[PDB]
Amino acid sequence: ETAPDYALSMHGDVALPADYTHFPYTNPDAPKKGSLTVGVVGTFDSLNPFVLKSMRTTARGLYNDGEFGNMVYQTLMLRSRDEPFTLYSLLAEKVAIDPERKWVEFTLNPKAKWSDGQPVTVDDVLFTYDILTEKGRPPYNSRMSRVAKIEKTGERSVRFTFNEKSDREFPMLIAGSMPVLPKHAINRDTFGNSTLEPPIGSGPYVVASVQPGQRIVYKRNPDYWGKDLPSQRGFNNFDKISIEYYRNETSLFESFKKGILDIFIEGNPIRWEKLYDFPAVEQGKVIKDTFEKGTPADMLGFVFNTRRPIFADRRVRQALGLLFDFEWANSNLFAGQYRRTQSFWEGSQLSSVGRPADARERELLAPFPGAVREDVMNGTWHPPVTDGSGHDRVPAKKAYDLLSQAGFQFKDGMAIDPTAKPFAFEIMTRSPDEEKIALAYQRNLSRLGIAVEIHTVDDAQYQQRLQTFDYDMILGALASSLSPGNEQWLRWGSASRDVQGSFNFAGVADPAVDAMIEALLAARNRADFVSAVRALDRVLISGDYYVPLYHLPYQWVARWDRIEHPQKTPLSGYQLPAWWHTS
Template sequence: MIVTILAGADDLRANEALQPVGGIAMHGVPELPDGFTHFPYADPAAPKGGTITYGIQGSFDSVNPFILRGQKVSGLRDAFYGNNVFESLMIRSHDEPFAMYGLIAENVIMPADRSFIEFILNQKARFSDGMPVTPEDVIFSAEILAKKGRPNYQKYYSRIRSMEKTGENRVRITFNGEPDRELPLLLSLLPILPKHAIHAETFDQTTLTPIIGTGPYLLTKVDQGSGITLTRDPNYWAKDLPVKRGLDNFDEIRFVYYRESKTLFEAFKKGLVDVYFDSDPNNWSAAYEGRALSEGRIIQSTFETGLSSGVRGYAFNTRRAPLSDIRVRKALSMMFDFKWMNENLFSGGYERTGSFFQNSELSALGVAASGNERALLRPFMAEIDPEVLEGRYQPSKTDGSGRDRAMLRAALTELQSAGYRLKDRVLVDHTGKPLALELLMASGGDQERVALSYSQTLATLGIQLTVRPVDAAQFEERRKTFDFDMLSWNWAGSLSPGNEQYFRWSSPFADQPGSFNFSGVKSKGVDAMIDAMLAAVEKSDYVDAVRALDRLLMSGRYVLPHYHMPRQLVGHSARIGMPQTVSLYGARPETWWIREVVQ
């Protein structure tokens, strides 16, 4: 429960020794100095104006992005397309692993033990209706999201002990004492909602009525399931702040929805959509053709990033037999023939994924555990594969023939140890029940080809895998309720994994509808490593804790990791201008502009 109180004089005097700062970081201090003029990956000379159209696969039935119900629309508050309508207290730099700079809160006060954080609001901060942002709005936002928001909000804000209005433009949030050094940064990401314009009683209901925010754009048009239009707010309060220079350059942003990825790509080639974020090497190398490309109206751009690869793959639902048996999960993982798929389906354009934090210092793949890792893992050694601990584990490798006999024999041996046997070319358990599973996925895209190839490999051992592509609405509903055997998903990578790991892997979220713990992981070791990760003061301790978590997840075979793209592939209209400096996170659409705009 969050308690809201007013600070007393003694509390205020105790804070006087702490100096306000304009930025905070998960480890150390932010890289940008006081008085910086703009983010390095933004061009402050970027022209303003024009319209950009993004294509989104799927549908939507709600413009409230903060609740569990419904299918939320993209682009209002979006980790990739930007916080166009709803902003946070502070803004994240995409050139650092996890650093926040002043926005609605221009400065913060935070003690070394991070037991509280005090936000000093920018007195110019305004909602789009002209009303000022107040401490009451901050407190209201935290309270309503804790009560009616998505489960991740409820988890974060459950650790707040009290919230205090400490001045005309000040709010102090005190935590409940559980060690979590990331929590102040997560609170700086708190989306600020207008207390005067929100109906608290119905906040958790889907709606197509726009909600006002503090951001640079207004939601001016909603076509249910088809698209939305955002229009620049001419009175946007923060347009001249250093953290906003060179950003938010379009007069109008349109998000248009398409049911299938192929339809979306065709719309892009016809000029109906300005950008196509590609994830198919075959498509990238062969499908960009026609007059638009030859005449230079479409450009193919690649972006190097410093991000970990994340994980695209299949979640095994361990709540259900036989996937509750790790031997079955091991065997199913062995039979993913990446080499054949990569060469025959994707022209060799992917790299194999084995770690949950691959391509970063946080990955434990191929690295023996350090002494500190072993100390962290000592109470949980029963959960650790010795091959993973010693750095010898790698995802299964095949000869690329599509029928690697050595791989099939090894998988069959694992399944036999779990009580299965072949009977009339069908794999059955001790009762004679066939091993039959369903793989749930969103329809469209390249994943159906992958799934069908995988099902054919499983069929050689008498395993029946039914590939079930469904529309976006059905997929959302079934994933939220864990109504699947296996689920195709893409877990985004991060250079600073934190509380979202609770939401993905921790025991309390295993049975929480709407969580991303699709596999139903209930591991004391995993829970302890996430706790250790968030309690780490020194960077080296943090890295060891994340690597230990990685080892537990790899050992548990909760997910069958697939592959990753070594770089970002973006097809886009030649009208779009982009800064020369690319962020650590790769392409950032909020930094783009329309070239044809005349100043």
């Protein structure tokens, strides 16, 4: 009775009422003529995103695409990019669901059609779970291990009943992380092969041409079945989208400058600052756009391997963390473009930084009295801000005092560890960019008498060492989101510390961490969830497992002025599928 029939939200929060006319970040009257040409670094030679063969060389744009979403293969429900985790109607016109999430039932829209004009049916859905289970790659072949029964319940209705291996997130994955495939158009015996035959989907774009290693051209189907859905209003505005493939970023950038590519998505701060001094920018023909987003910025940090005795003591990790001089690095290496990262959910509502712990967090954390530092609990903690000099005496004195409390001596002019050895460790780096930042950190550590070796290892040997946790310190990245879930166990869970190949690079094993992961998974409403995640953040910060580095505070997209976008930018940042070509 309480469940909407037109939406499915992970934690029950649904921003749009049933009669919405469009997602709030689209222009409901966007022009519909003209093309978009974008570049990517890499290659492709196949057109099946759901199978092992050629999985690393599959064309962009078909399904699960970061910039373009699902242009050929569609899901039952469509994710809004203005909410943390809410899905709205797409192939499924209606949804019904068990309060306890033991079953979910979808009713297909009777207008739904494949691009060849055949109907999308319940039989296509059943076929989809059959063939992907038998012949798909992970994760697409793993869904049925959670499903007790899949059955047709009406002319256009299908119900999934789940088994005890399922969890509250699982129905979300059925609704939004599986395609629907066309039974009538797929040769089952060859499904799985590398293929360059244009595949049939229900999406708005068809594959018009394919030049392997070079270019895929999508054309809009004028008879696209979903064109009038409120969930599609102001999307799919380009009548043609070409994705071109380049061997490196410089080649790609040059092709943008020549007007062959319409946009350039920029992540390099030196390039953004220095290299957009070409005439088109000065004439206003190329616009440097910036956007903000409320999804978190991915963590980048130095990672302490807490398994090594040198780094077992959190007080030592805390001291060494204070010595990184971000303000010097930003100013001298990065043209001031970065902002300091402080939280594992940086820039989002899930960050604990600058927020006193709420009543729910304090309840959750009370059984773990040592787990969160007072400054972190009260929201007064931040990493040091230096004078930018590269030799600021203030964080260094705090570091010196902490190491002394932890048993260090200083005897000229070395830092001596509690076992009476001169303190020394290695930073394993993978690239010249990593070396450059490690070198900067090394200069500050050396000023306290600490000897640091920087050792660059090629990619394959680097991964061999990651696998066995064979390092003192590395640089580590995390793919963050507004919906942390089961993946948190392999990052931070105490069982993952001793599993070779896990993602727990710091070797975290703390019942408080485990308990906060349990709590965020148990949360059934967005308030409890936010509280639990913040509490996880507080514990992780208080362990000094990472020395958090930096992130870009704006998204950057340069564009020829023949490309436009809505004034509004949603929670997830810019959304290319809502952009259009000027008249």
